[PDB]
Design a protein around this ligand. Structure first.
Ligand SMILES: Nc1ncnc2c1ncn2[C@@H]1O[C@H](COP(=O)(O)O)[C@@H](O)[C@H]1O
Ligand SMILES: [Mg+2]
Ligand SMILES: [Zn+2]
Length: 321
Protein backbone atom coordinates (compact mmCIF):
# COMPACT_ATOMS: atom_id res chain seq x y z
CA UNK A 1 0.00 0.00 0.00
CA UNK A 2 2.98 2.38 0.47
CA UNK A 3 3.77 1.96 -3.23
CA UNK A 4 0.10 2.63 -4.06
CA UNK A 5 0.12 5.91 -2.13
CA UNK A 6 3.43 6.84 -3.80
CA UNK A 7 1.92 6.17 -7.24
CA UNK A 8 -1.09 8.37 -6.36
CA UNK A 9 1.13 11.27 -5.31
CA UNK A 10 3.20 10.90 -8.52
CA UNK A 11 0.04 11.43 -10.62
CA UNK A 12 0.62 15.17 -9.94
CA UNK A 13 4.11 15.16 -11.56
CA UNK A 14 2.96 17.63 -14.27
CA UNK A 15 1.48 20.10 -11.73
CA UNK A 16 2.94 23.00 -9.79
CA UNK A 17 2.63 22.12 -6.10
CA UNK A 18 3.46 18.39 -6.20
CA UNK A 19 3.64 16.92 -2.67
CA UNK A 20 7.42 16.48 -2.93
CA UNK A 21 8.02 15.95 0.82
CA UNK A 22 5.42 13.19 0.94
CA UNK A 23 7.03 11.57 -2.10
CA UNK A 24 10.42 11.76 -0.35
CA UNK A 25 9.02 9.73 2.57
CA UNK A 26 6.86 7.34 0.51
CA UNK A 27 9.75 6.46 -1.80
CA UNK A 28 12.07 5.51 1.09
CA UNK A 29 14.06 8.73 0.72
CA UNK A 30 14.40 8.44 -3.05
CA UNK A 31 12.49 11.49 -4.32
CA UNK A 32 15.15 12.39 -6.91
CA UNK A 33 15.28 8.84 -8.31
CA UNK A 34 11.49 8.28 -8.51
CA UNK A 35 10.68 11.79 -9.82
CA UNK A 36 13.44 11.66 -12.45
CA UNK A 37 12.37 8.15 -13.52
CA UNK A 38 8.73 9.26 -13.73
CA UNK A 39 9.60 12.35 -15.80
CA UNK A 40 11.90 10.39 -18.14
CA UNK A 41 9.04 7.90 -18.73
CA UNK A 42 6.48 10.71 -19.18
CA UNK A 43 8.66 12.45 -21.80
CA UNK A 44 9.70 9.14 -23.46
CA UNK A 45 13.39 10.00 -22.96
CA UNK A 46 14.51 6.39 -22.37
CA UNK A 47 13.29 5.42 -25.85
CA UNK A 48 14.44 8.63 -27.58
CA UNK A 49 18.01 8.39 -26.22
CA UNK A 50 18.23 4.60 -25.85
CA UNK A 51 18.80 4.79 -22.10
CA UNK A 52 18.65 1.33 -20.49
CA UNK A 53 16.25 1.53 -17.53
CA UNK A 54 18.69 -0.22 -15.16
CA UNK A 55 21.41 2.29 -16.12
CA UNK A 56 19.09 5.23 -15.44
CA UNK A 57 18.10 3.89 -12.01
CA UNK A 58 21.69 3.05 -11.09
CA UNK A 59 22.92 6.52 -12.04
CA UNK A 60 20.01 8.23 -10.28
CA UNK A 61 20.50 6.38 -7.00
CA UNK A 62 24.24 7.07 -7.18
CA UNK A 63 23.64 10.78 -7.82
CA UNK A 64 21.01 10.97 -5.07
CA UNK A 65 23.47 9.34 -2.61
CA UNK A 66 25.87 12.26 -3.26
CA UNK A 67 23.34 14.78 -1.93
CA UNK A 68 23.98 15.17 1.83
CA UNK A 69 21.39 13.59 4.16
CA UNK A 70 22.17 16.03 7.00
CA UNK A 71 21.66 19.39 5.26
CA UNK A 72 18.13 20.72 5.74
CA UNK A 73 17.74 22.43 2.35
CA UNK A 74 20.41 21.52 -0.25
CA UNK A 75 19.55 17.85 -0.27
CA UNK A 76 17.94 15.30 -2.59
CA UNK A 77 14.45 16.78 -1.97
CA UNK A 78 15.60 20.19 -3.28
CA UNK A 79 17.15 18.43 -6.30
CA UNK A 80 13.88 16.55 -6.95
CA UNK A 81 11.88 19.76 -6.54
CA UNK A 82 14.02 21.73 -9.03
CA UNK A 83 13.83 18.81 -11.49
CA UNK A 84 10.03 18.68 -11.26
CA UNK A 85 9.64 22.47 -11.42
CA UNK A 86 11.84 22.62 -14.53
CA UNK A 87 9.74 19.77 -16.01
CA UNK A 88 6.57 21.87 -15.49
CA UNK A 89 8.17 25.04 -16.90
CA UNK A 90 9.32 23.13 -20.00
CA UNK A 91 5.68 22.20 -20.66
CA UNK A 92 4.42 25.81 -20.71
CA UNK A 93 2.16 26.44 -23.77
CA UNK A 94 4.30 29.40 -24.92
CA UNK A 95 7.32 27.10 -25.37
CA UNK A 96 5.53 24.20 -27.10
CA UNK A 97 7.80 22.63 -29.75
CA UNK A 98 10.52 25.27 -29.10
CA UNK A 99 13.23 23.04 -27.60
CA UNK A 100 14.80 19.89 -29.03
CA UNK A 101 14.81 16.59 -27.18
CA UNK A 102 18.53 17.06 -26.39
CA UNK A 103 17.85 20.55 -24.96
CA UNK A 104 15.02 19.11 -22.83
CA UNK A 105 17.34 16.33 -21.65
CA UNK A 106 20.06 18.88 -20.83
CA UNK A 107 17.73 21.09 -18.76
CA UNK A 108 16.31 18.18 -16.72
CA UNK A 109 19.73 16.55 -16.21
CA UNK A 110 21.23 19.93 -15.18
CA UNK A 111 18.40 20.35 -12.65
CA UNK A 112 19.05 16.91 -11.16
CA UNK A 113 22.77 17.50 -10.61
CA UNK A 114 22.63 21.23 -9.93
CA UNK A 115 23.44 21.15 -6.18
CA UNK A 116 25.02 17.71 -5.79
CA UNK A 117 27.48 17.31 -2.91
CA UNK A 118 26.43 20.69 -1.46
CA UNK A 119 28.05 21.13 2.00
CA UNK A 120 25.28 23.37 3.40
CA UNK A 121 27.32 26.61 3.30
CA UNK A 122 27.57 29.41 0.71
CA UNK A 123 30.17 30.27 -1.88
CA UNK A 124 31.13 33.35 0.16
CA UNK A 125 31.59 31.22 3.27
CA UNK A 126 33.80 28.84 1.29
CA UNK A 127 35.82 31.79 -0.07
CA UNK A 128 36.17 33.54 3.33
CA UNK A 129 37.32 30.36 5.10
CA UNK A 130 40.00 29.55 2.50
CA UNK A 131 38.30 26.20 1.85
CA UNK A 132 39.71 23.51 -0.40
CA UNK A 133 36.84 24.04 -2.86
CA UNK A 134 37.50 27.78 -3.12
CA UNK A 135 41.22 27.04 -3.64
CA UNK A 136 40.43 24.56 -6.41
CA UNK A 137 38.07 26.94 -8.20
CA UNK A 138 39.75 30.33 -7.71
CA UNK A 139 36.75 31.79 -5.88
CA UNK A 140 34.66 31.68 -9.10
CA UNK A 141 31.32 29.82 -9.09
CA UNK A 142 32.93 27.56 -6.52
CA UNK A 143 29.98 25.31 -5.66
CA UNK A 144 28.45 25.36 -9.14
CA UNK A 145 31.70 24.17 -10.76
CA UNK A 146 31.83 21.42 -8.14
CA UNK A 147 28.21 20.30 -8.65
CA UNK A 148 28.94 19.93 -12.36
CA UNK A 149 32.19 18.02 -11.86
CA UNK A 150 30.55 15.54 -9.46
CA UNK A 151 27.40 15.14 -11.61
CA UNK A 152 29.51 14.32 -14.67
CA UNK A 153 32.06 12.19 -12.77
CA UNK A 154 29.33 9.85 -11.50
CA UNK A 155 28.43 8.84 -15.08
CA UNK A 156 31.75 6.89 -15.04
CA UNK A 157 30.63 4.46 -12.30
CA UNK A 158 29.63 0.91 -13.31
CA UNK A 159 26.37 0.91 -15.28
CA UNK A 160 25.88 4.68 -14.76
CA UNK A 161 26.51 6.18 -18.21
CA UNK A 162 22.98 7.19 -19.16
CA UNK A 163 24.35 8.94 -22.27
CA UNK A 164 26.17 5.83 -23.60
CA UNK A 165 23.97 5.70 -26.75
CA UNK A 166 24.15 9.38 -27.67
CA UNK A 167 26.43 10.28 -30.59
CA UNK A 168 29.72 12.08 -29.87
CA UNK A 169 28.18 15.28 -31.26
CA UNK A 170 25.15 14.93 -28.98
CA UNK A 171 27.37 14.23 -25.95
CA UNK A 172 29.51 17.29 -26.68
CA UNK A 173 26.47 19.52 -27.14
CA UNK A 174 24.75 18.20 -24.03
CA UNK A 175 27.86 18.66 -21.90
CA UNK A 176 28.17 22.29 -22.98
CA UNK A 177 24.48 23.03 -22.39
CA UNK A 178 24.51 21.43 -18.92
CA UNK A 179 27.61 23.38 -17.92
CA UNK A 180 26.06 26.65 -19.13
CA UNK A 181 22.82 25.95 -17.25
CA UNK A 182 24.28 24.95 -13.87
CA UNK A 183 26.83 27.80 -13.91
CA UNK A 184 23.83 30.15 -14.36
CA UNK A 185 22.44 29.01 -10.96
CA UNK A 186 25.30 30.90 -9.23
CA UNK A 187 23.51 33.81 -7.46
CA UNK A 188 26.34 36.24 -8.32
CA UNK A 189 25.11 36.00 -11.93
CA UNK A 190 21.42 36.64 -11.11
CA UNK A 191 21.34 40.37 -11.96
CA UNK A 192 23.04 39.90 -15.33
CA UNK A 193 20.85 36.90 -16.14
CA UNK A 194 17.71 38.86 -15.26
CA UNK A 195 18.85 41.89 -17.31
CA UNK A 196 19.28 39.58 -20.31
CA UNK A 197 15.89 37.94 -19.76
CA UNK A 198 14.28 41.41 -19.69
CA UNK A 199 15.97 42.26 -23.00
CA UNK A 200 14.55 39.02 -24.45
CA UNK A 201 11.05 39.96 -23.24
CA UNK A 202 11.34 43.45 -24.74
CA UNK A 203 12.40 42.07 -28.15
CA UNK A 204 10.30 38.90 -28.21
CA UNK A 205 8.70 37.57 -31.37
CA UNK A 206 6.00 34.89 -31.64
CA UNK A 207 4.47 30.43 -29.32
CA UNK A 208 7.85 32.09 -28.73
CA UNK A 209 10.33 32.20 -31.61
CA UNK A 210 13.88 31.44 -30.50
CA UNK A 211 16.34 30.23 -33.17
CA UNK A 212 19.99 30.70 -32.18
CA UNK A 213 21.87 28.86 -29.41
CA UNK A 214 22.30 32.19 -27.55
CA UNK A 215 18.57 32.86 -27.04
CA UNK A 216 17.63 29.20 -26.45
CA UNK A 217 20.34 28.59 -23.86
CA UNK A 218 19.54 31.91 -22.12
CA UNK A 219 15.89 30.87 -21.76
CA UNK A 220 16.91 27.45 -20.32
CA UNK A 221 19.38 29.13 -17.95
CA UNK A 222 16.63 31.43 -16.69
CA UNK A 223 14.15 28.57 -16.58
CA UNK A 224 16.32 26.43 -14.31
CA UNK A 225 17.19 29.54 -12.20
CA UNK A 226 13.42 30.16 -11.77
CA UNK A 227 12.97 26.50 -10.77
CA UNK A 228 15.81 26.84 -8.27
CA UNK A 229 14.11 29.95 -6.83
CA UNK A 230 10.58 28.54 -7.03
CA UNK A 231 9.85 27.84 -3.37
CA UNK A 232 8.10 31.21 -2.65
CA UNK A 233 5.76 30.55 -5.67
CA UNK A 234 4.54 27.21 -4.30
CA UNK A 235 1.40 26.59 -2.21
CA UNK A 236 2.01 28.00 1.27
CA UNK A 237 2.29 24.67 3.10
CA UNK A 238 5.22 23.77 0.81
CA UNK A 239 6.82 27.24 0.90
CA UNK A 240 6.82 27.35 4.70
CA UNK A 241 8.65 23.99 4.84
CA UNK A 242 11.30 25.22 2.40
CA UNK A 243 11.69 28.40 4.49
CA UNK A 244 12.08 26.38 7.69
CA UNK A 245 14.81 24.36 5.98
CA UNK A 246 16.86 27.13 4.39
CA UNK A 247 16.72 29.17 7.62
CA UNK A 248 18.07 26.16 9.51
CA UNK A 249 21.02 25.98 7.09
CA UNK A 250 21.57 29.73 7.33
CA UNK A 251 21.62 29.60 11.15
CA UNK A 252 24.02 26.61 11.17
CA UNK A 253 26.36 28.55 8.85
CA UNK A 254 26.04 31.60 11.11
CA UNK A 255 27.00 29.41 14.09
CA UNK A 256 30.17 28.36 12.26
CA UNK A 257 30.87 31.98 11.37
CA UNK A 258 30.42 33.10 14.98
CA UNK A 259 32.74 30.34 16.25
CA UNK A 260 35.49 31.47 13.82
CA UNK A 261 35.31 35.14 14.85
CA UNK A 262 33.82 36.12 11.49
CA UNK A 263 31.12 38.67 10.79
CA UNK A 264 27.80 36.78 10.58
CA UNK A 265 26.27 36.80 7.09
CA UNK A 266 22.80 38.32 6.50
CA UNK A 267 19.95 36.06 7.78
CA UNK A 268 22.44 33.65 9.43
CA UNK A 269 22.35 35.07 12.98
CA UNK A 270 19.80 33.06 15.02
CA UNK A 271 20.02 35.70 17.81
CA UNK A 272 19.20 38.64 15.48
CA UNK A 273 17.03 37.20 12.70
CA UNK A 274 13.59 37.98 11.35
CA UNK A 275 12.58 35.11 9.13
CA UNK A 276 9.43 36.95 8.00
CA UNK A 277 11.26 40.16 7.01
CA UNK A 278 13.90 38.11 5.23
CA UNK A 279 11.26 36.34 3.11
CA UNK A 280 9.51 39.57 2.15
CA UNK A 281 12.91 41.04 1.22
CA UNK A 282 13.96 37.98 -0.79
CA UNK A 283 10.68 38.05 -2.75
CA UNK A 284 10.71 41.83 -3.30
CA UNK A 285 14.34 42.14 -4.43
CA UNK A 286 15.02 38.79 -6.15
CA UNK A 287 12.15 36.33 -6.60
CA UNK A 288 9.36 38.63 -7.77
CA UNK A 289 11.51 40.64 -10.25
CA UNK A 290 12.64 37.31 -11.74
CA UNK A 291 9.24 35.57 -11.86
CA UNK A 292 7.40 38.64 -13.09
CA UNK A 293 9.88 38.77 -15.99
CA UNK A 294 9.44 35.05 -16.69
CA UNK A 295 5.66 35.53 -16.52
CA UNK A 296 6.00 38.32 -19.14
CA UNK A 297 8.06 36.08 -21.44
CA UNK A 298 5.37 33.38 -21.41
CA UNK A 299 2.35 35.65 -20.73
CA UNK A 300 -0.17 34.59 -19.60
CA UNK A 301 0.89 30.95 -18.90
CA UNK A 302 2.51 31.72 -15.53
CA UNK A 303 -0.18 33.97 -14.06
CA UNK A 304 -1.31 31.41 -11.44
CA UNK A 305 2.33 30.95 -10.29
CA UNK A 306 2.87 34.72 -10.05
CA UNK A 307 -0.45 35.12 -8.18
CA UNK A 308 0.66 32.49 -5.66
CA UNK A 309 4.00 34.24 -5.18
CA UNK A 310 2.16 37.53 -4.55
CA UNK A 311 -0.30 35.94 -2.09
CA UNK A 312 2.63 34.34 -0.20
CA UNK A 313 4.49 37.67 -0.06
CA UNK A 314 1.34 39.31 1.37
CA UNK A 315 0.95 36.48 3.90
CA UNK A 316 4.51 36.80 5.24
CA UNK A 317 4.16 40.60 5.30
CA UNK A 318 0.94 40.31 7.31
CA UNK A 319 2.79 38.48 10.11
CA UNK A 320 5.28 41.33 10.71
CA UNK A 321 3.08 44.00 12.43
N1 LIG B 1 13.22 30.87 0.82
C1 LIG B 1 14.39 31.48 0.64
N2 LIG B 1 14.72 32.53 1.47
C2 LIG B 1 15.91 33.20 1.32
N3 LIG B 1 16.80 32.82 0.35
C3 LIG B 1 16.48 31.79 -0.46
C4 LIG B 1 15.29 31.09 -0.35
N4 LIG B 1 15.29 30.13 -1.30
C5 LIG B 1 16.44 30.22 -2.02
N5 LIG B 1 17.18 31.24 -1.49
C6 LIG B 1 18.49 31.78 -1.90
O1 LIG B 1 18.79 31.48 -3.26
C7 LIG B 1 19.95 30.68 -3.34
C8 LIG B 1 19.66 29.58 -4.37
O2 LIG B 1 20.80 28.81 -4.68
P1 LIG B 1 21.02 27.39 -3.97
O3 LIG B 1 21.01 27.71 -2.45
O4 LIG B 1 22.39 26.90 -4.29
O5 LIG B 1 19.83 26.44 -4.26
C9 LIG B 1 20.21 30.19 -1.92
O6 LIG B 1 21.58 30.03 -1.66
C10 LIG B 1 19.60 31.23 -1.02
O7 LIG B 1 20.50 32.27 -0.72
MG1 LIG C 1 23.07 25.98 -6.07
ZN1 LIG D 1 19.65 24.93 -5.79
Amino acid sequence: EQEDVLAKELEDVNKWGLHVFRIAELSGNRPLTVIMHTIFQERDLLKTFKIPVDTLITYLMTLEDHYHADVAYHNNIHAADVVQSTHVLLSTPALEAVFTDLEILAAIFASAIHDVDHPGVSNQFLINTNSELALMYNDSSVLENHHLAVGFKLLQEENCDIFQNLTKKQRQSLRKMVIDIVLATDMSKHMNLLADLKTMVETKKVVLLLDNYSDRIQVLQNMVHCADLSNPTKPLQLYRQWTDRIMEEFFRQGDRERERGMEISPMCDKHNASVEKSQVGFIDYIVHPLWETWADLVHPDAQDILDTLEDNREWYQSTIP
